[PDB]
Amino acid sequence: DTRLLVIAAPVLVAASWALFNIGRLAIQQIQRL
Amino acid sequence: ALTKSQINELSYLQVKGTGLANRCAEVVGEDSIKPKPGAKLVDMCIEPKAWAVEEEVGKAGKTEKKFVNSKVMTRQTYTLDAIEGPITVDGGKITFSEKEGIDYAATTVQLPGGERVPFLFTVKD
Amino acid sequence: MLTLKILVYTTVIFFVSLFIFGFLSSDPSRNPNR
Amino acid sequence: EEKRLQELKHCRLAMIGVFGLWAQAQASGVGVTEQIGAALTTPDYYAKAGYFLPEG
Amino acid sequence: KLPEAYAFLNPIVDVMPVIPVLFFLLAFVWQAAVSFR
Amino acid sequence: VSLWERFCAWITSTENRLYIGWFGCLMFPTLLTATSCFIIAFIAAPPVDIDGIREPVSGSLLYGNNIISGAVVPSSNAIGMHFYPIWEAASVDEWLYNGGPYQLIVLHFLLGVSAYMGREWELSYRLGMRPWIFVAFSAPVAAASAVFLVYPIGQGSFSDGMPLGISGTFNFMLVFQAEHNILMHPFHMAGVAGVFGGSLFSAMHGSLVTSSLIRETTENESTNYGYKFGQEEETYNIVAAHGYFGRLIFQYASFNNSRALHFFLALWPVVGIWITAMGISTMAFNLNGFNFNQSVVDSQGRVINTWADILNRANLGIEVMHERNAHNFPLDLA
Amino acid sequence: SVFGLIGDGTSYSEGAAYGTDQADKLYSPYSVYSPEGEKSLYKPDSAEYLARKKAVLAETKNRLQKIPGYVDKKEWFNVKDELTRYMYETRGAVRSLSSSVTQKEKAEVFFRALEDTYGAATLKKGDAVKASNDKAIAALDAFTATL
Amino acid sequence: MEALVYTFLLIGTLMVIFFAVFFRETPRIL
Amino acid sequence: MITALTALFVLVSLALVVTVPVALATPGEWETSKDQFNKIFQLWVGLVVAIATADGISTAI
Amino acid sequence: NARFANGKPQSIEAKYIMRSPAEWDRFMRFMDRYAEANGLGFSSXXXXXXX
Numbered sequence A: 001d002t003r004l005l006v007i008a009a010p011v012l013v014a015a016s017w018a019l020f021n022i023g024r025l026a027i028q029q030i031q032r033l
Numbered sequence B: 001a002l003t004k005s006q007i008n009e010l011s012y013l014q015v016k017g018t019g020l021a022n023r024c025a026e027v028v029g030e031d032s033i034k035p036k037p038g039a040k041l042v043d044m045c046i047e048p049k050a051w052a053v054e055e056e057v058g059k060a061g062k063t064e065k066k067f068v069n070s071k072v073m074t075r076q077t078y079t080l081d082a083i084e085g086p087i088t089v090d091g092g093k094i095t096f097s098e099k100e101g102i103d104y105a106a107t108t109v110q111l112p113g114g115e116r117v118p119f120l121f122t123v124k125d
Numbered sequence C: 001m002l003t004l005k006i007l008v009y010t011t012v013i014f015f016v017s018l019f020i021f022g023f024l025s026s027d028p029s030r031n032p033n034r
Numbered sequence D: 001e002e003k004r005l006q007e008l009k010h011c012r013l014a015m016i017g018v019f020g021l022w023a024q025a026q027a028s029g030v031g032v033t034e035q036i037g038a039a040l041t042t043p044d045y046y047a048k049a050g051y052f053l054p055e056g
Numbered sequence E: 001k002l003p004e005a006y007a008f009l010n011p012i013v014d015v016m017p018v019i020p021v022l023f024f025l026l027a028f029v030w031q032a033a034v035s036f037r
Numbered sequence F: 001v002s003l004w005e006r007f008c009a010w011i012t013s014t015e016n017r018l019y020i021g022w023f024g025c026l027m028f029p030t031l032l033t034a035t036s037c038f039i040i041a042f043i044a045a046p047p048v049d050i051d052g053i054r055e056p057v058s059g060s061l062l063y064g065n066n067i068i069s070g071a072v073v074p075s076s077n078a079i080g081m082h083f084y085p086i087w088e089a090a091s092v093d094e095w096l097y098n099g100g101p102y103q104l105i106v107l108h109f110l111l112g113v114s115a116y117m118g119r120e121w122e123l124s125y126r127l128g129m130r131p132w133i134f135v136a137f138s139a140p141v142a143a144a145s146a147v148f149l150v151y152p153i154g155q156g157s158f159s160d161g162m163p164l165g166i167s168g169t170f171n172f173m174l175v176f177q178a179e180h181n182i183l184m185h186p187f188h189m190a191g192v193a194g195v196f197g198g199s200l201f202s203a204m205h206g207s208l209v210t211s212s213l214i215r216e217t218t219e220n221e222s223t224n225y226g227y228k229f230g231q232e233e234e235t236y237n238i239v240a241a242h243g244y245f246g247r248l249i250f251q252y253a254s255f256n257n258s259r260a261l262h263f264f265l266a267l268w269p270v271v272g273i274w275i276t277a278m279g280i281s282t283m284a285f286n287l288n289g290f291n292f293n294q295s296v297v298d299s300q301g302r303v304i305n306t307w308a309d310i311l312n313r314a315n316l317g318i319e320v321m322h323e324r325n326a327h328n329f330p331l332d333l334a
Numbered sequence G: 001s002v003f004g005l006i007g008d009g010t011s012y013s014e015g016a017a018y019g020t021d022q023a024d025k026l027y028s029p030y031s032v033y034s035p036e037g038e039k040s041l042y043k044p045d046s047a048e049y050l051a052r053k054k055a056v057l058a059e060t061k062n063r064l065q066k067i068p069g070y071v072d073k074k075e076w077f078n079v080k081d082e083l084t085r086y087m088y089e090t091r092g093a094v095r096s097l098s099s100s101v102t103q104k105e106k107a108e109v110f111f112r113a114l115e116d117t118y119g120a121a122t123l124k125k126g127d128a129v130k131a132s133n134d135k136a137i138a139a140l141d142a143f144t145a146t147l
Numbered sequence H: 001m002e003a004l005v006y007t008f009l010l011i012g013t014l015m016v017i018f019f020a021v022f023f024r025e026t027p028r029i030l
Numbered sequence I: 001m002i003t004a005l006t007a008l009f010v011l012v013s014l015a016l017v018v019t020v021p022v023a024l025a026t027p028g029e030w031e032t033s034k035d036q037f038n039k040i041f042q043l044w045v046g047l048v049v050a051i052a053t054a055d056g057i058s059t060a061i
Numbered sequence J: 001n002a003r004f005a006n007g008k009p010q011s012i013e014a015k016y017i018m019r020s021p022a023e024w025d026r027f028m029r030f031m032d033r034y035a036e037a038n039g040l041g042f043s044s045x046x047x048x049x050x051x
C-alpha cells in the first residue's frame, strides 16, 4: 500500500478544510468579518 | 603592438576588447640565430596592414591594370596566428615548410565602386 | 569617426537634459485645475 | 552668532578629521593624496591595455 | 529526503508549498461570505 | 518671466497642433531618426550577413527586392549583443556590411515608442481626462520590445531579432515555430484569444451601436450626418441594442452597463497581448511550449502518433533548414 | 468485453502508473520521489579509487613546481591557468582523502596558501606568488605525509 | 526600373498621410 | 522522541491556525479568552525550544 | 572601444567637455527660473502650486 498517497491526499483535505472553516465558523458566530 | 614579453604580462580580461589580439608582436635588435637541424618556427603571427585588389583603372587617356588600396569589411578577423612548420636547410638556404596553425582568414574587402571582394588570406601548404 | 561620436553625444545629453528639467520644472502644476 | 557657531561646528568636526588623518597615515605609510588619488585610478592589473585598433 | 526523524511527515511537507496560493483563494471566499460588499 | 518660462509653457502648450511635451523631447528626435534611417535603409542599404558566415543578404529595394521580400536585416551574428554604433565601425562601408542600421532603427524605435507612451499620458494629464490610455498602448510596446530586444537578449544576439520587412517577419515566425513551438504555448493561445475575441467584440460593439441608431437623416444622405460633433443627446438607443443582444444569447449575461462594457473592450485585447508578449519573452529564455511528442504509447510500447507529432514534424522541417550552414554541431543551442 | 487496466494508484500497475514504490517491489528506494536504492550495494567507496586520488596529489606537486618558472618569465595568466587546469581535481581529492581533524587542518592551511597565490597572481606581485607557493608546497608535502 | 514604382508608391502614401494630418477638415462644435 | 513531539506540535498548531483568527475577528472573544491563548502560545514556543534541543542533542549524540 | 567597459561610455576628455557643458547649459536655463527662490513647503497631496 502506498501510504504516501494515502497520507498526501488527506493532508490536502485537512489543509483545504481548515482555513475554509474559518470562513464557516466566523459566519455561524456571526461577528465582524 | 609591443613585444611578446609584455603582451604575456597582460591577463586575458584586460586584453579583451582592446584590439590587441590581432597585433603581431615586435622585435627590438639586430642579431643572427643560425637554426639547427631539428628546430622550427612556432608562433608565426602574420598581419596584413594594407590590402590591394587588381582592377581596370582610369587615368590620363589610357586604361590598364593596377591595385587600389581597399578597405576591410570584416572587423578584426583577418590575421593569422600560431602557425608552425619544421625548418630545414639543404643547399645552404633555409626553408620553412608550413604545416599547422590558423592558416586562413576569411576576409572580405570592398572595392572603390561598391564591389565586395571576399577571399581567404591563407598560408596553407 | 570620433567627430560623429561627439555630435551624437552632444544631441543625446541635450534632449535628455530637457526631459530631466521638464519634470523638475513643477510638472505636477502643469494642470487644468489650478 | 552665526560665526561662533560655524567656528564651533568645524572645531568639533576637524578633531575627528585629524584623528582620521592620523590613523590613515599609520594604517598606510602614505599621505592622503596617495590614498584618495590611489582609489581613483583603475589599478594597473585591472585596467585594460589600450586602443590598438587601426584606422583602416 | 528529510532527516530520519522528520521522514514520517513527508506528505505533510508535500502540501506545504501550495498553501500560499490557497490564502489568495480565501480572499475571494471571504468576499462571497460578506457577499461582495 | 524667464526664458525658461516662455519655453516650458510652449513645450506643454496644449494649443499646439501636435503636442510636444517633455516626452516629445525624447520622442520626436528619436522617432525621426528611426523613420529616416528606415527610409534610407529600406531603399539603399548594402547587403548584410545575418549569420556571420560572410554570406550577405540583400534587403534594400535598389538591389532587386520587392516591397514584400525587401527588409532591413538584423545585425551580424558575429556582433552578437555588442552595441555597434556608427563610430565603432572603421567605416560606414563596414557599418552597413555588418548590420549596423538594424541597431540604429531598433534602439530608436524602442526609445521613441516608450516616449510615445509617456506622451499619451502627459497630455491626458494636461487635458484633465482620466489617464490610462497609454496602459492600453503598453500591449504593443510589450510586444515590440519582446521581439526586438528581449528575444535578442535571451538568445544572445541581435541577429535573432525580427527583421524589418514583410517577408522578413515571416522568416522570424517560422524559425520561432521550429525551435520554440509557439503554437503549443498557452501564453500564445491566450493572446490569439485576445485577437480573435478582440476583433470579435469590435465587430459586435460596432454592429450593436450602428443597428440601434436614432432617426435624423434622410434616405439620400449618409447616416453619419445624424451625429453632429459635440452633441448632448445620445446618438443611438442603448435599450434597443441591449434588448436585441439580450435575446441573442441570454438575459442575465450580456449585461446592461455601457460604461462597464467599454472596460471589457479595453481589457480583452490588451490583457491578451500582454500575455503573448510574455509568451515570446519567456521563450526568449528558452522555456518552450508543450512537447507532447511520443506521449501516447500502447500496451506493447510503440509510439502511437497524435496531431502533436505531425506538428513537431513541421518543426523538424523548419529546424533542419533555418540558417543551414551557420550550424556546425548537432544541437541548436545558440 | 474489456475491463481495461484501471490502475487507480492503489490498484494494479504495469507500465504507466506512478505509484512511487509499488513496481519497485521491496528494493526500497532512497526516498519515494526517486527510483534508485539508497547506498548499500555494488559500490564499496573504500575500494581502489585511491589510486586516482593519490595520483592527483602526485601530479599536484609537479604543477606547483611550474609556478616560479612562470613568474620570472612574467606570465601571469599561466600562473592563474595552471592553478586551475590540472589543479581542479585537488579539492575533490584532498577533501575526499582527509579523514581526521588533523588532516582537515592541514588541508585548511594548504587551501589558504593556495588561494593567496591566485590572489597575488591577480594582483601581479611576483614576490608574493613565490612566497605563497613555498607556503603551499610545504603544506602539500606535510599533508601527503600525514596518511 | 520597378524600384521607381516602389519608391513612388511608398513616398506616395507618405505624402497622402502628410495632407491627412495637417490639411484635414477640422471638426467644429457649432 | 522527536517524531512524537512534532506530531503534537502539528496538532496544537491546527487549533492555533483555526481558533485564533476566529477569536481575533470576534469583537468580544479576545479580551476574555486572551489568557487561554497566552497559555497555548507560551506552550507552543516552549515546544519549539524543546524540539530544537532534541535535534541538537540527537544529531551530535 | 566596443566593450572596452567604460564609465557612461566614453574614451576621451573631449566628451567630458560635452557631457558636463550640455547638462550645465540646459541646466543654467533651468536655474534662471528657479534661482534665488527656496523654502515654502506646502503639506498637501502634490500641490507644489507655487509660481
Ligand code: CLA
Residues within 6 Å of the ligand: F113, F139, F140, F141, F142, F143, F144, F146, F147, F172, F173, F174, F176, F177, F182, F183, F188, F191, F192, F195, F196, F273, F276, F277, F279, F280
Ligand atoms: C490563425 C493564426 C494566427 C493568429 C491569429 C496569430 C495571432 C498572433 N500572433 Mg501568431 N503565429 C501563428 C498563427 C497565428 N498567430 C503561427 C502559425 C505561427 C508560427 C509561424 C505564429 C508565430 C508567431 C510569432 C513568432 C509571434 C506571433 C504573434 C502573434 C500576436 C500578434 C502580435 C501583434 O502583431 O500585435 C502586437 C503589435 C505589435 C508588435 C506592433 C507594435 C506597434 C508599435 C508599438 C508601433 C508601430 C508604429 C508603426 C511603426 C508606424 C505607425 C504607422 C504610422 C506612420 C501611420 C497575435 C496574438 C507575436 C506575439 O506573440 O506578440 C509579440 C509574435 O511574436 N505569432
Ligand SMILES: CC(=O)O[C@H]1CC(C)(C)C(=C=C/C(C)=C/C=C/C(C)=C/C=C/C=C(C)/C=C/C=C(\C)C(=O)C[C@@]23O[C@]2(C)C[C@@H](O)CC3(C)C)[C@](C)(O)C1
Residues within 6 Å of the ligand: D010, D011, D013, D014, D016, D017, D018, D020, D021, D024, D032, D036
Ligand atoms: C587677523 C587674523 O587672525 O586673520 C584671521 C581672522 C579670522 C576670523 C580668524 C579668520 C580665519 C580663519 C581661517 C583662515 C580659518 C581656516 C579654517 C580651516 C582651514 C578650517 C578647516 C576645517 C576643515 C575640516 C573641518 C575638515 C574636516 C575633514 C574631515 C572630517 C574629513 O572627513 C577628512 C579626510 O580624512 C577624512 C577623515 C578621510 C580621508 O580619506 C579624506 C578626507 C578628506 C575626507 C580670517 C578672516 O580668515 C583670518
Ligand SMILES: CC1=C(C#C/C(C)=C/C=C/C(C)=C/C=C/C=C(C)/C=C/C=C(C)\C=C\[C@@]23O[C@]2(C)C[C@@H](O)CC3(C)C)C(C)(C)C[C@H](O)C1
Residues within 6 Å of the ligand: D015, D016, D018, D019
Ligand atoms: C598636521 C601636521 C602635524 C600636526 C599636528 C598637530 C599639532 C595636530 C593636532 C591635532 C589635534 C589637536 C587633534 C585633537 C583632537 C581631539 C579629538 C580627536 C577628540 C575629541 C573627541 C571626542 C570623542 C569627545 C568626547 C566626549 O564625548 C565624549 C566621548 C564624552 C562627553 O561627555 C564629553 C566629550 C564631548 C569630550 C604633524 C604632527 C607635525 C605632522 C605633519 O607633518 C603636519
Ligand code: OEX
Residues within 6 Å of the ligand: F077, F155, F159, F160, F175, F179, F322, F323, F332, F333, F334
Ligand atoms: O540566428 Mn536566427 O536561428 Ca535562434 O537558433 Mn541559434 O540563432 Mn540562429 O540558429 Mn538557430
Ligand SMILES: [Fe+2]
Residues within 6 Å of the ligand: F209
Ligand atoms: Fe460606444
